[PDB]
Structure formats: C-alpha cells, structure tokens
Design an enzyme around this catalytic site. Sequence first.
Site, PDB file in Angstrom:
ATOM      1  N   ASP A  75       0.827  -1.200   0.000  1.00 28.13           N
ATOM      2  CA  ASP A  75       0.000   0.000   0.000  1.00 28.13           C
ATOM      3  C   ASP A  75       0.866   1.257   0.000  1.00 28.13           C
ATOM      4  O   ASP A  75       0.497   2.278  -0.581  1.00 28.13           O
ATOM      5  CB  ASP A  75      -0.907   0.006   1.229  1.00 28.13           C
ATOM      6  N   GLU A 106      -5.521   4.911   0.106  1.00 29.41           N
ATOM      7  CA  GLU A 106      -4.386   4.017   0.303  1.00 29.41           C
ATOM      8  C   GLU A 106      -3.831   4.199   1.714  1.00 29.41           C
ATOM      9  O   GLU A 106      -3.389   3.242   2.342  1.00 29.41           O
ATOM     10  CB  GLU A 106      -3.289   4.298  -0.731  1.00 29.41           C
ATOM     11  N   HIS A 109      -6.009   2.413   3.932  1.00 29.04           N
ATOM     12  CA  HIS A 109      -5.740   0.988   3.797  1.00 29.04           C
ATOM     13  C   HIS A 109      -4.525   0.633   4.647  1.00 29.04           C
ATOM     14  O   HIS A 109      -4.543  -0.350   5.397  1.00 29.04           O
ATOM     15  CB  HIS A 109      -5.514   0.630   2.328  1.00 29.04           C
ATOM     16  N   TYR A 113      -4.432  -2.099   7.761  1.00 30.04           N
ATOM     17  CA  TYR A 113      -3.544  -3.242   7.864  1.00 30.04           C
ATOM     18  C   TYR A 113      -2.667  -3.210   9.114  1.00 30.04           C
ATOM     19  O   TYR A 113      -2.434  -4.243   9.739  1.00 30.04           O
ATOM     20  CB  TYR A 113      -2.667  -3.347   6.611  1.00 30.04           C
ATOM     21  N   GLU A 169      -1.672  -3.543  -8.254  1.00 30.35           N
ATOM     22  CA  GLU A 169      -2.940  -3.461  -7.555  1.00 30.35           C
ATOM     23  C   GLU A 169      -3.926  -4.540  -7.972  1.00 30.35           C
ATOM     24  O   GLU A 169      -4.862  -4.838  -7.236  1.00 30.35           O
ATOM     25  CB  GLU A 169      -3.542  -2.073  -7.764  1.00 30.35           C
ATOM     26  N   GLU A 203      -9.383  -1.471  -4.554  1.00 35.38           N
ATOM     27  CA  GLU A 203      -8.319  -1.826  -5.477  1.00 35.38           C
ATOM     28  C   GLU A 203      -8.891  -2.102  -6.855  1.00 35.38           C
ATOM     29  O   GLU A 203      -8.290  -1.739  -7.865  1.00 35.38           O
ATOM     30  CB  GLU A 203      -7.542  -3.039  -4.973  1.00 35.38           C
ATOM     31  N   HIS A 206      -9.364   1.145  -8.395  1.00 32.07           N
ATOM     32  CA  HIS A 206      -8.085   1.759  -8.730  1.00 32.07           C
ATOM     33  C   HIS A 206      -7.497   1.124  -9.979  1.00 32.07           C
ATOM     34  O   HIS A 206      -6.770   1.772 -10.733  1.00 32.07           O
ATOM     35  CB  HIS A 206      -7.109   1.633  -7.558  1.00 32.07           C
TER      36      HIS A 206
HETATM   37 CO   LIG Z   1      -5.029   0.926  -4.702  1.00 29.72          CO
END
Ligand SMILES: [Co+2]
EC number: 1.17.4.1
Lengths: 288, 288
Positions: A75, A106, A109, A113, A169, A203, A206
């Site tokens: 990421d 992102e 994200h 995580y 991605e 994703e 994206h």
């Molecule tokens: Co992405």
Amino acid sequence: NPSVEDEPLLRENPRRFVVFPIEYHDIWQMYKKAEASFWTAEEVDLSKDIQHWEALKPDERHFISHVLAFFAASDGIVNENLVERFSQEVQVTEARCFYGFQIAMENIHSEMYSLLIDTYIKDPKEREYLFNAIETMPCVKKKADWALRWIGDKEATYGERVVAFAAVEGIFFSGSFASIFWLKKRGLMPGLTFSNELISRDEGLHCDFACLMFKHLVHKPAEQRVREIITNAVRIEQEFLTEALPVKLIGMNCTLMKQYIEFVADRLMLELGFNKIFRVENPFDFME
Amino acid sequence: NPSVEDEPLLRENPRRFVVFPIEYHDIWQMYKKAEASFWTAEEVDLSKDIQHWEALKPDERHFISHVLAFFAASDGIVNENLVERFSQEVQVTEARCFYGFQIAMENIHSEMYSLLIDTYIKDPKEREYLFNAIETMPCVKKKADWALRWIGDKEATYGERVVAFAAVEGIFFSGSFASIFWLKKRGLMPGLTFSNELISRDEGLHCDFACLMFKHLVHKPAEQRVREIITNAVRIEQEFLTEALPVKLIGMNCTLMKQYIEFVADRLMLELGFNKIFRVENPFDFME
Ligand SMILES: [Co+2]
Ligand SMILES: [Co+2]
C-alpha cells in the site's frame, strides 16, 4: 520526453485547473464512484478478532501474518508512486481528483492493515518483523522491488508504468484477496474479511481507473510489451503463493490458486483493450 | 539543500513508510481530526439558492461572483503546491497522511465553488469569465501570482514556503470568509454560507497543521522574515477588500474589515510561536 505534447492526459495545457468545466465525464464519473465509497478504519470493528486469531492454527496465523505484512508495505509502495509520479504527471483535473482520492484511501488501507497486525500480534517484537517485511522478508522483497523499480525507472513511459501498477494493484493483490475471501467462506476472522471486502473493492476501482488512463493515452506500449509486464507479474505472484507462502497453509489448492491469478490477469488484459493471454476460467465461485 | 539531513520532517530516514508505528501523535491527531471532518459537495443542498441570488442586489452579486471566482482558483493554487512540493518533501508518514487528506478536501472545495458559480450564473459566458479569473481578473491575479510564486521558488526553504501558504489559507481567505459569515448574519444565501462554514473550518485546520509543521522544523526563517511574509499578505488582502472588491458592496465597513485581517494575522503569528504584529481586537463578534 519525445511526443508528450500530443498527450491530452499529460500535455501542459491546463492553464485552468478549475473543476466543474468537466472535459472528461468518464474520468470524473470514476472519481465520483470512489468518493461515494469512502470509509475509515474506525468503521471496522476489531474488538472481537483477538479471540479468532487464537482459535486459528499455527500454519494459518503464519499465512495471515505474512499476507498482512506484504500488505503493510505494498500500500505504501503504491502511494509513493502516486505522490511523486502519477499525480505529478497527469495535468487533467478529473484525473488529479481521482488520484488525490486514491492516495487518501491508500493511507486508510495502510492504517487498516497496521491496525489488524497490532490486534493479532501484541508482541511489539514480532510487530517490527512484519512491519519491515520489505527488508526482513525476502519473499515480499521480490515483489516490493518489482513495483519499486517502476517508480525509479526514469526511462519507462507513463504508459508502461500505468500498466505495471495496474498489475500491482490487480495481480499482486489478487492471490491475497482470494485467500482472505476463502477464509470468509470458512467463517474465520470477521475483522480481516470485512476490511478485505472494502479494500478489494477499492483496489478493483483503482485498477479500472488505471485501465481508463491507459485508454486516454495516445502513444502507449505495444501489446507485446503489455503482455510481458502482465506475465512477469503473474509468475511473480504465483511463485509467492505456491512456494514462498503456499495457500496450502490455509487449506487451499495451489493449482486452483495459480489458475485464478491467470484469470485475473486476463480480465486486466481485456479492460486494457487487448485479448486474453491464458484463457482460463475463474476457479473460485466465491470470486465472481 | 544545506543542512536538510538534520530535519526530522524532511530527512530521508523513512525506509519504513509503514503507519501504525506512529512517531508523532500530535501530527497523527491532526490527521484524525481532518478525517472525521470529511464531507462531500453532494451534502450541500443548492436546490434553493437560485432564487436567493435573484433577490440579491446588483452590487451584492458583483461582490459574491468575484469572491467565488477568487475561490475557484485559490483552492487550485494550494492544491498544486501540496502535490508537487509539500507532499513530496515531507518524509514523515503522519504528515504525508494529513497532506494526502488536505489534497482530497481541496478538490472537494474546488468542486463546491464551481457548483456554486454554476448555480448562480447560468450563462456559460460569464461562467468562463469567473472560472479563468487568474487571467481574466487583475485583482485576483495579484494574489494568485503571490502564492504561485512560492510554488516555483526553487530557493525559498520549506520553512518560508510553509509560512507563505499558511498565510494564503489563513490571511487570503480571511476577508472572504468573514464577508460570507456577514451575509449569514444578514440571512442571505443559505447555500453559500453553509458551504462556507465547512470550508472555513477545513482551512482553519489546514492552517493549524502548517503551523505545527513549522514547529517541527529545526532550521526555519527568522522571526523578522516571518513578519514580512505575513505582513505582505495582510497588505495584499486589505487592498483586495477595500479597493479591488470593497466590502462596502455588501454593507460592510472597510475599516473594520482591515482590522479583522490584522487580527487573523496576529493569531497566525501566535500559532507559529511568535508575538503579535498588530495587536488589534477582533472587530466582528460573529467571527469568534
Ligand atoms: Co489501490
Ligand atoms: Co486548505
């Protein structure tokens, strides 16, 4: 920088940088889709996954922790590229808006995580091991360097670089996304599978945008060039899920996983306007 | 690039780019504040301001249209700087997250302003006049060039540039933000004043963050240097609201407006860790 002035996407013809006088509704529509999909990590309840991580088996935790580590870094790699490259190059307002949003998502994200890892690994020692996977883990390094190389490649055109990251991605996350959806099917780790649903969706968006940018590119790589970038990504990803981190560790069939990676690669090729490379069916009914 | 390696904020010591291992909670907290303040333009109902724009007086519309035009551009100027500079320079994860969010919110601000213009000016001809104010309007150009200059200044350090944009988002918007709040007090243009409340709030946060970055800077401009950048911004803004676009056009006292700009400039100086320059009180009870 040869014939860059003939690129509607890159040509320095803004002298506007205003917004509503939208020129590309297709790009703007993509941005609006992303905006409406906004979410924050605080929206994912993890106040219960600590127990699930216990009931898990040694091989399973091993797989998950490693998959998460791979995510904690990837990421970031993507984000840096978007910050010091794509968002810089593209002069089209609509695209800049989409990229601005992608960056923000992102980072959410990344936070998600890291939040997951912290929840499962309370030992700050192992935490550091996973957080610095890019250097602490060789397997994750082969992929990290692959993408990282496209960032520092001062020769590769935007066309090649856009396809490479669409592959990161799309292909580099495919295997892991599928592994998590597999766990969801097995009713395991609600926190991990819920966040995985929000992330995988982002994703996918994206990736679609990357393909849309590729299309607005006039002078782009030849099909053969595209096939090799995508193919190199498929082999890298397959090796990662069948040797470095066998999906067998969580009860998945290595062969079927290999077929899924090829499937995902084919969809990407179609979205880019080219023919399929592998011509395989999606082996997972829970991924359609 | 002399002693840049000694700057915790700029030094290339990431080699991490992970997130949760938060090093600066003060910066992270700022980012979390911004995240929770997220909003989209679709959240502002403009299905009623078309009538209000009619009941308005010729001088008032003149003031508003011009203020909006100034906004349709400024938000862009700021955004470009953040994209091709700040977000590039800063290597601290927490700061990058805040900047990533600021960018997204600035694009939402741009959209909001263009949406407002379109709603009030249905004539696509006048629309283009306001949308390209940077070149169609000399008054707005003096300010546009001021900020734009800090973007292309390859000599000015991050310290000076961070203060300059804190001045743009704080001093250059102050007068206009106050003018709109004034209208709200007079019960006029609900759509304009509502969006103004969300935007002014975001700018205030973006300004506080700028000051926080300044503080994390070790080698920064001397107080005298800061006072002149801020002071040049005050004079530019005052001239704009008392000559180019007199607030008298909407029933405001030019002198009181001048005092408010100085007030706002003083708050910025305090937030930066320095003493006040003008030492004046806030002349508007609806701005405290
Ligand atoms: Co992405
Ligand atoms: Co701002």
